[PDB]
Amino acid sequence: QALLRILKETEFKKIKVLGSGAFGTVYKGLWIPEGEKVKIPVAIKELREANKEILDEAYVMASVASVDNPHVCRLLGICLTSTVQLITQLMPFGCLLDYVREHKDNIGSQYLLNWCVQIAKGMNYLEDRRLVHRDLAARNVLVKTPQHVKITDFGLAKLLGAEEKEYHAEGGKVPIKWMALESILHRIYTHQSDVWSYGVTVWELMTFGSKPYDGIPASEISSILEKGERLPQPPICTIDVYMIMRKCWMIDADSRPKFRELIIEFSKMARDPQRYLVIQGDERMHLPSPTDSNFYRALMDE
Ligand SMILES: COc1c(Cl)cccc1Nc1c(-c2ccncc2OC[C@@H]2CCCO2)[nH]c2c1C(=O)NCC2
Ligand SMILES: [Cl-]
């Protein structure tokens, strides 16, 4: 039962742009609800050139609100202004793609493998709620703290019926370099096509934000995949980590790993992280943590 909370425009203060792009425009702000009188850091999303498109996103997010998973973004409510806006808790450390690019010199094995676990736990939750994301990528993972990441952006997400195993898409722009072959060829999307995208997302993290198939046009991808070519082994990845990615990119969808399997294997690896990822100076690296006495420094800076 999907309940949309409508937030008053007048309850938001110090609204400022964070960034723009394919996702539209995201702002940060302080939501002070009347009565409670407490300042809650919030992110605000809108499109600028339909109000329909963003309500579909709010529906899907409202539809999977029954259970609180810590690794998927919660809709706090919408706001009606000049445009329709989505509202969520601010993820202060921002987008994981940008984060791995900027903090490369202090990202150790433990962090990369833990992130992989947390994204698999988030997708497993969404699979249980019959949700196909259709846009899993580093750009659609956010950082609450360097130890804690959440899946976001349900603009392409589809809920499957009790009977339905797959969603057939119509003519609509889609991220080719993150999509399974059968999605490129036949516009078919399943939980197992999301596993392919999970594979690409992991490659992005292990390369500290490299562009997949860089300098290759989107029209050559299906032919490259049909020849048996895949994204290369990242320098830091031992064979077991790369084999997981290659299992995610298998032609037979049902042969690909399940998220429940990916949780367990990446969990096993997180218990001995230096065995599975080889990073120079791993033990000398550090990122801010809530347990740190001076963590309030990082939150205010970022
Ligand atoms: C769908 O969940 C949201 C809602 Cl309901 C409201 C506002 C933002 C989001 N999520 C997103 C954030 C976001 C959510 C929370 N806190 C900070 C955020 O942005 C951080 C940086 C700024 C611009 C790129 O990401 N950033 C992005 C989305 C998104 O949906 N697609 C890609 C970029
Ligand atoms: Cl693309």
What's the burial of 298, exposed, middle or buried (CB within 10 Å: 0-12/13-18/19+)? middle
Residue 18 CA: nearest ligand 1 atom is 22
Count CB atoms within 10 A of the CB of residue 239.
9
Across the strands, what pairs with 257? none
Chain centre distance of CA 203: 13
CA distance 199 to 189: 15
Distance from residue 213's CA to the centre of ligand 2 (Å): 9
Taking CA atoms, 111 is separated from 96, 116, 162, 210, in Å, by 12, 9, 37, 18
Place of tokens 């919030």: 42
* Letter string b/e over residues 9-21, b meaning 16 or more CB atoms within 10 A of that residue's CB: eebbeeeeebeee
Across the strands, what pairs with 24? 21
Chain centre distance of CA 141: 3
CA angle 301, 29, 100 (to 5 degrees): 45
Contacts with 184 (C-beta within 8 Å, 6 or more apart), sequence order: 176, 221, 222, 225
Numbered residues of the known binding site for ATP: 18-26, 45, 88-89, 153
Place of tokens 């993290």: 205
CA distance 45 to 87: 7
CA distance 273 to 252: 30
Distance from residue 295's CA to the centre of ligand 2 (Å): 36
Taking CA atoms, 9 is separated from 33, 59, 71, 122, 298, in Å, by 10, 20, 28, 31, 29
Provide residues with CB under 6 Å of ligand 1: 18-19, 23, 26, 43-45, 73, 75, 86-88, 90-91, 94-95, 139-140, 142, 152-153
189 neighbors 158 (Cβ within 8 angstroms): yes
Chain centre distance of CA 70: 13
Query: What is the CATH code for 96-284?
Result: 1.10.510.10
78 neighbors 259 (Cβ within 8 angstroms): no
> For residue 232, what is the DSSP state?
P
Contacts with 253 (C-beta within 8 Å, 6 or more apart), sequence order: 180, 182, 190, 192, 193
CA distance 57 to 155: 5
Method: X-ray
> For residue 134, what is the DSSP state?
S
CA distance 72 to 108: 23
155 neighbors 57 (Cβ within 8 angstroms): yes
CATH 3.30.200.20 positions along the chain are 9-89
* Letter string b/e over residues 99-117, b meaning 16 or more CB atoms within 10 A of that residue's CB: bbeebeeebbbbbbbbbbb
CATH 1.10.510.10 positions along the chain are 96-284
Look at residue 183 and give its three-state secondary structure.
helix
- Closest by CA position to 134, among listed 181, 73, 195: 195
- CA quadruple 88, 94, 96, 97: dihedral, nearest 10: 120
196 neighbors 135 (Cβ within 8 angstroms): no
Query: What is the CATH code for 9-89?
Result: 3.30.200.20
> For residue 30, what is the DSSP state?
E
CA distance 264 to 262: 6
Catalytic residues: 135
Ligand 2 is an ion; residues with CB less than 5 A from it: 175-177
As a whole number of angstroms, the longest Cα–Cα distance in the chain is 62
Q: For the chain, how many helices (H) and strands (E)?
A: 10, 11
Distance from residue 45's CA to the centre of ligand 1 (Å): 7
